[PDB]
Amino acid sequence: SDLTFCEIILMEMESHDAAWPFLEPVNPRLVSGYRRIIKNPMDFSTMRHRLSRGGYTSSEEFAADALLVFDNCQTFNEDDSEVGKAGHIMRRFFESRWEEFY
């Protein structure tokens, strides 16, 4: 049942206003320099697919994939960019609610 809270928090993240940059994997054909800079891309739908498949053995693995989405976001996007400003909203939301369970 370590993962039943992950379904809640991923469902809440999937439907958050500011989740639009992270619903689908970043298409590197459209973003100059992404493949070069971001070694391990991650997004909500890949997390949904791994969760759907049972690929998260512990609750901390799910959080590692989640923090990676935002570490990527800060690595590539300026803090005042549209994607950056949304990644900060999502990152505080995730951390604020991850602590509300743990």
Ligand SMILES: Cc1[nH]c(-c2csc(N3CCNCC3)n2)c2c1C(=O)CCC2
């Ligand atoms: C994490 C991330 N999301 C986006 C982005 C821009 S537009 C858009 N969408 C989502 C897909 N269909 C509609 C509009 N998603 C970027 C990004 C980066 O890290 C680099 C800059 C571009």
Ligand SMILES: Cc1[nH]c(-c2csc(N3CCNCC3)n2)c2c1C(=O)CCC2
């Ligand atoms: C998965 C994904 N879909 C799109 C997308 C569809 S339409 C459109 N534009 C951007 C330029 N002005 C016209 C409309 N962008 C992107 C994307 C990414 O991964 C990165 C950002 C771009």
